[PDB]
């Protein structure tokens, strides 16, 4: 019923954790027309406007750097404070 | 118990660099700010640096801002003080202190026992010990003059501690950029010279230890 960015389980320690496959939109195959290679070097750019959006269950804004496209794993050494720090709580 | 025990120091020639450290025990170190203070030969107390409860801010006085740098590692509960471009005016005894919060100001609860820093250009010299007997009554005061050593301190023990009850140890006095002290002991005429009296002078800086039997003149 909806694309879901987070899945807390596995599909019927594992490498299938957080994998909601039913979120696939499909593939776009590009190629020069014709039996033979094109005569020119080409570059295609794909833009995407999202329309008619509906969202549910809001959640904490990622405050740590992303490491992988799949999971939310972060760097357990480089755990930085959400925002700019200061000297004392009495100085501005 | 709250314990601050510091390490490092000794003789350094002027211009050299050194690092001092203090080790904490029996209180949560991270929740406190920590400072060093120095005492010139038992008189003047001078603040030299503080560090915030975490990394945060460091604060320095205007005699030192530039050469010293105070640090902490809140895994082993230990302060650090590196001192670079050390000068002759930096000779003193350095304590590590804990800084607590009061109504408005701050206060230093516990002080460590200090390390001693001597910044100086001369050599390390073993001392010379000379007996002090007299050339007539019922009490005998003997002595032991130990002259021309560097640095401090030295130690004068009398018959290996047996005579400690009648012993005066007079502070070492600096002249010739060498130190010179005296030490006296008091003894009943029943003990001397019928029994050996001997002063024992140990100078750890050089690992030199000399013994003088006081023989009657």
UniProtKB/TrEMBL annotation, chain A:
* Cell compartments where the protein resides: Host cytoplasm; Virion
Task: List the protein's name.
Answer: Genome polyprotein
